[PDB]
UniProtKB/Swiss-Prot annotation:
Its EC number is 5.2.1.8. It comes from the Eukaryota. The gene is FKBP1B. One of its GO terms (molecular function) is calcium channel inhibitor activity. This is Peptidyl-prolyl cis-trans isomerase FKBP1B. Belongs to the FKBP-type PPIase family. FKBP1 subfamily. Residues 19-107 form the PPIase FKBP-type domain. Its main location: cytoplasm. It comes from Homo sapiens (Human).
């Protein structure tokens, strides 16, 4: 369950398609916990394409429901990212994921 909470401004018409590489200033956040990831610190804003299962499934479907300039707020259920496995040392199992995501794409 991907539940978008959008900070408004953008265009609402430039939508990502298959095989299009998009650039995201994402920000990881744990519910009732601290940060666990940030693309703003490295200043390397994570060039990735659409449709190759590189990212987790909760992060993947949230980007297709956005547009250029927009600023959503992901809330990932544990079943789509790590809730059975748990990323060892960084993401414990049965974890609810929060992401501040800005979509500033190209292509």
């Amino acid at each position: 369950g991907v539940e978008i909470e959008t900070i408004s401004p953008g265009d609402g018409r430039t939508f990502p398609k298959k095989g299009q590489t998009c650039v995201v200033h994402y920000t990881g956040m744990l519910q009732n916990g601290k940060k666990f990831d940030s693309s703003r610190d490295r200043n390397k804003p994570f060039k990735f394409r659409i449709g190759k299962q590189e990212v987790i499934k909760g992060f993947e479907e949230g980007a297709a429901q956005m547009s250029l300039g927009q600023r959503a707020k992901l809330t990932c259920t544990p079943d789509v990212a790590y809730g059975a496995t748990g990323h060892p040392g960084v993401i414990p199992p049965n974890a609810t994921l929060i992401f501040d995501v800005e979509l500033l794409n190209l292509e």
